[PDB]
Amino acid sequence: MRHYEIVFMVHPDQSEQVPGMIERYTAAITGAEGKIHRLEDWGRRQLAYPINKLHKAHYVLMNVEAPQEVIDELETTFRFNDAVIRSMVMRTKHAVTEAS
Amino acid sequence: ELQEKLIAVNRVSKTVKGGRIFSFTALTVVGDGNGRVGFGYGKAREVPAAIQKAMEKARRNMINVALNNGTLQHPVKGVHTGSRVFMQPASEGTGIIAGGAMRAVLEVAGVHNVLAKAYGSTNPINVVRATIDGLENMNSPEMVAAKRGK
Amino acid sequence: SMQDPIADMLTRIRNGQAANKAAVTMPSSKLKVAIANVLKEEGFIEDFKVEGDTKPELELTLKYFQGKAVVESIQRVSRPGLRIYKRKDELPKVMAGLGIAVVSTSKGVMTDRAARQAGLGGEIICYVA
Amino acid sequence: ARYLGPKLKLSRREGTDLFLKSGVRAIDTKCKIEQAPGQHGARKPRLSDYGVQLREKQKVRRIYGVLERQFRNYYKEAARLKGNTGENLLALLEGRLDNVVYRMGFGATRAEARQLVSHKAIMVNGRVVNIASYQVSPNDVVSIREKAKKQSRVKAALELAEQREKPTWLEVDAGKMEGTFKRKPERSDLSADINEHLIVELYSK
Amino acid sequence: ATVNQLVRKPRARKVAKSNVPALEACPQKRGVCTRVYTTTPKKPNSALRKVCRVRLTNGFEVTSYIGGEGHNLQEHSVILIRGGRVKDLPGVRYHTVRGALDCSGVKDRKQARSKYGVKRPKA
Amino acid sequence: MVTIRLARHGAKKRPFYQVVVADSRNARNGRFIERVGFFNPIASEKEEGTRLDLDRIAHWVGQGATISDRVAALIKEVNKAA
Amino acid sequence: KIRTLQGRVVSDKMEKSIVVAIERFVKHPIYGKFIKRTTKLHVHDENNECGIGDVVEIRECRPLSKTKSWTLVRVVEKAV
Amino acid sequence: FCRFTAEGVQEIDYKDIATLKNYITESGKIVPSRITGTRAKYQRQLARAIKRARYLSLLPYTDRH
RNA sequence: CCCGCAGAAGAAGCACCGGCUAACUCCGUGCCAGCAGCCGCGGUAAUACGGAGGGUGCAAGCGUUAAUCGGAAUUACUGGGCGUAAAGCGCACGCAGGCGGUUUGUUAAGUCAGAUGUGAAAUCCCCGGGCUCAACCUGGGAACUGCAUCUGAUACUGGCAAG
């Protein structure tokens, strides 16, 4: 039961399936009695440098209050699924619901 | 950096015992682009010193605008002498629409989309500073809350 | 003939706010006190009292935030020459919602911000701005 | 129903490159671009507000080779659609089949790319199309017929297409000489200098 | 401008009648020219302008400026009426169409060749 | 004679043969009673060019409205399922 | 109940019928001022009961004469 | 002077991009606190942000990518 | 509609270039000839006349004329004014009409809510489908801002009774 910051990018050609993913991801946190604090979709933002060749990947931001074992499984799910590239999971001291 | 732009140039004249001498007047407006506008109007016998005096007078008598992200807060009617001014915020995807003398005041205000219509006098000196009213006496939600209590 | 006792009273606010007076003074009716409540709960006035029984009077204490007036542009709308009657949905929003329009609906008088969710309109009295 | 006159004068009037030449030779060597065409082209314009309004309207018209009456319904379709009207016309302009063929690079010029579509030589979704202004929906596979396949115009056009951007919203494949229309392009993809706001205020009056 | 005065009598805007009384709002009409003559224009300007009165086939007898460099119009000829006010000559508000019916086009004109009724020379 | 008649509403050489409850003496493309469906004889590979509402036509023959030959072809083409 | 209207009786002396003034408070379609628009309707009754200054309720019926397709049903305030 | 000792910032947010552009030289490196005058406390949370921001490629590592 | 023949081969004009309004120079004309939607140009140095070059704007169309709306808030219901620009009757009384202090109770006409029926189809708008695209055809929804009826509310106006 701890607050985390989750940001992951998506391959641009798989942009149409992204609303399913947070819908699929929120079934994992709230399914595991956690809760969602901030959802926002940054869209196809141009990156400063190319990763796996490519340009203008799709960014997704998420603030999560959950226990750590489920978020371990999402980290594997980012590793397992090819469509998500360059994920990052952090840590926030308190729950945050702000802009930007 | 405050968006130097001119509006109109006019030629005015004197009559004297020798005859008729001429002079030129320049209309300019400036503004940082985030809720702040200064307007100027200068006169000289030649055109470039008139604009010089116009931009220099524009970068004083500073008036701020209570502004949202890219547009206004409410409809407000602006009058001065003979010109009547209508302004109305529009959608974010819409651009700005106005008259030519109604134009250049608005981009230097930071407003990006307003249904603006000029009424009565179309005089460029008169429609400007009539648009400043409305922007000058503009009411924002946070300070009317302080004006009332909530 | 003094032919709109309401339309006198909003001008008392207009003349009181412009002259920066402390209080305004006008005979009272029930509808006069009714919109006096609406000005109170929106913070456009501080206190109103009803005094007298043989000739009742309504006493209003105006407001001056930064010294200048609090009421800015107040306008009677439903005048005896032309009564304005609008339904629940086409009630306009004053100052794009930052101001309010008091309205005599069938269930009572209130602002526009109280009538639209309640789902009933009536006499569009005035907009306070 | 095309301009079909001298091409570099159109680039000379606008003053910039309008991609109406293949790029085999530098445009500075081909024409004296720095001044406008004609006898009086070197003079100062002092152009009016409507002048740069109109010059921006002709400009975007002349890369894509689209006439004014066809340009108007392009704006009218963009006006009736949702979203911002400025990029919507740019989205609609990029949907042209000759523009798509050039954007994937089968044509040396978009006038040359228009001739590929006109001369019964382009197959989309396994269907041949003659109309140059065919709007391309997403997930549409463009291709070439058996004729104009391994023909000298479409080989030389491909070799000069490598030095350009190779745009993101299309999947070019020179090995089988085809491609797919993956997504509609956005405003951030196309050269970032087209004053689309000047476009709107010309048709808003 | 009181509303009680407006219900009793509504707002009335005048019709602002047509500049040219070309009958039945027809865009052209033919007519027989009676007298061809020349006239001096209004005060700021000066010329010897070619004008004719024409009896229209509708019945009206009005005047009309005949344009172009020179002409070969006589009495009883039938010409087309075009319209358009000539402000330098008071009274005449109509034009004739060059190259139509008995009216000939303008000899050897190149610019505005369509509007002056001249055929395209071979090029 | 209230009948079940078939009307032509399509473009030139591309007929969209609309079926419609119409009076006998009225025009083919003119006045009628109500719409129950259509028939598009130049339909695509997908089958939606011939749609009828079986309930409304059944009430009309139950009312006493005679039907013509071509509408009789449409009901006996869809039969009950296909 | 049935469709009925209530208006002021405008005449006093017509043979076994009456004209009744129906008064309305409709809105003007352009300027919006609420004005009094009255209509006078020929109304039948037996042996001429009602009179001037009276208010009656009238109902729609079959045509019995020219403009007289109505008949009253009940009288109220038969006094000046 | 330091901008972050005033304005009451609890911790520097890496998702706020506009401030970080001002504090990075155009080549891509982190400028020192000896130039901007940032407090040594706030420079430490600052420098972690660009390392975090470069990971999601919001900020370039070098100018020669 | 598909396949094959031959070869750039069978296929570009129209208006404008003084300002409004995009595009300027030369020659002839010399208040003549003429142009002109308005301002105005031409009386021996015309970016405004006629020709030429060049440019601009459209395009199998381009211009002129006519016609409606817009701009015109220039009949101002939304949304104008009446001292000097047009406009307060020369001044009163006064029928109709318009409107009306203040409180109690009644009524529910105006008014407001809800429901029902209707507002034909076609047209407009939105989401789709087919003609190689488009125009065009067409599925479904929305809309049809209105009308009548029925049931409720009585803040105000209206009516009634009493102060």
PDB file of C-alpha atoms in Angstrom, chain A residues 52-93:
ATOM      1  CA  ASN A  52      14.699   1.790 -31.844  1.00  0.00           C
ATOM      2  CA  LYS A  53      15.113   4.147 -34.832  1.00  0.00           C
ATOM      3  CA  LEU A  54      11.660   5.848 -34.919  1.00  0.00           C
ATOM      4  CA  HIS A  55      10.313   9.294 -33.982  1.00  0.00           C
ATOM      5  CA  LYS A  56       7.389  10.856 -32.090  1.00  0.00           C
ATOM      6  CA  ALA A  57       6.379   8.134 -29.640  1.00  0.00           C
ATOM      7  CA  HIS A  58       3.169   8.203 -27.583  1.00  0.00           C
ATOM      8  CA  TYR A  59       3.537   9.049 -23.884  1.00  0.00           C
ATOM      9  CA  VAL A  60       1.251   7.948 -21.033  1.00  0.00           C
ATOM     10  CA  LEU A  61       1.456   9.160 -17.412  1.00  0.00           C
ATOM     11  CA  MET A  62      -0.094   7.519 -14.346  1.00  0.00           C
ATOM     12  CA  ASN A  63      -0.117   8.057 -10.570  1.00  0.00           C
ATOM     13  CA  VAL A  64      -0.860   4.891  -8.612  1.00  0.00           C
ATOM     14  CA  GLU A  65      -1.538   3.963  -4.995  1.00  0.00           C
ATOM     15  CA  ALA A  66      -1.176   0.183  -4.793  1.00  0.00           C
ATOM     16  CA  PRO A  67       0.798  -2.593  -3.090  1.00  0.00           C
ATOM     17  CA  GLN A  68       4.140  -3.522  -4.696  1.00  0.00           C
ATOM     18  CA  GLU A  69       3.468  -7.057  -5.964  1.00  0.00           C
ATOM     19  CA  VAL A  70       0.933  -6.050  -8.614  1.00  0.00           C
ATOM     20  CA  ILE A  71       3.204  -3.256  -9.893  1.00  0.00           C
ATOM     21  CA  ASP A  72       5.955  -5.859 -10.152  1.00  0.00           C
ATOM     22  CA  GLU A  73       3.651  -7.696 -12.567  1.00  0.00           C
ATOM     23  CA  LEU A  74       2.966  -4.556 -14.614  1.00  0.00           C
ATOM     24  CA  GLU A  75       6.728  -4.010 -14.884  1.00  0.00           C
ATOM     25  CA  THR A  76       6.967  -7.513 -16.333  1.00  0.00           C
ATOM     26  CA  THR A  77       3.970  -6.661 -18.527  1.00  0.00           C
ATOM     27  CA  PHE A  78       5.893  -3.684 -19.895  1.00  0.00           C
ATOM     28  CA  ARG A  79       8.848  -6.023 -20.423  1.00  0.00           C
ATOM     29  CA  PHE A  80       6.691  -8.741 -21.983  1.00  0.00           C
ATOM     30  CA  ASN A  81       4.616  -6.645 -24.389  1.00  0.00           C
ATOM     31  CA  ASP A  82       6.552  -5.221 -27.334  1.00  0.00           C
ATOM     32  CA  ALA A  83       4.225  -2.269 -28.010  1.00  0.00           C
ATOM     33  CA  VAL A  84       5.426  -0.425 -24.885  1.00  0.00           C
ATOM     34  CA  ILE A  85       8.989   0.912 -24.997  1.00  0.00           C
ATOM     35  CA  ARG A  86      11.082   2.803 -22.408  1.00  0.00           C
ATOM     36  CA  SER A  87       8.953   2.467 -19.279  1.00  0.00           C
ATOM     37  CA  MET A  88       9.752   4.072 -15.929  1.00  0.00           C
ATOM     38  CA  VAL A  89       8.365   3.393 -12.442  1.00  0.00           C
ATOM     39  CA  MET A  90       9.219   5.659  -9.515  1.00  0.00           C
ATOM     40  CA  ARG A  91       8.323   6.597  -6.284  1.00  0.00           C
ATOM     41  CA  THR A  92       6.217   9.428  -4.868  1.00  0.00           C
ATOM     42  CA  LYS A  93       6.088  10.338  -1.200  1.00  0.00           C
TER      43      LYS A  93
END
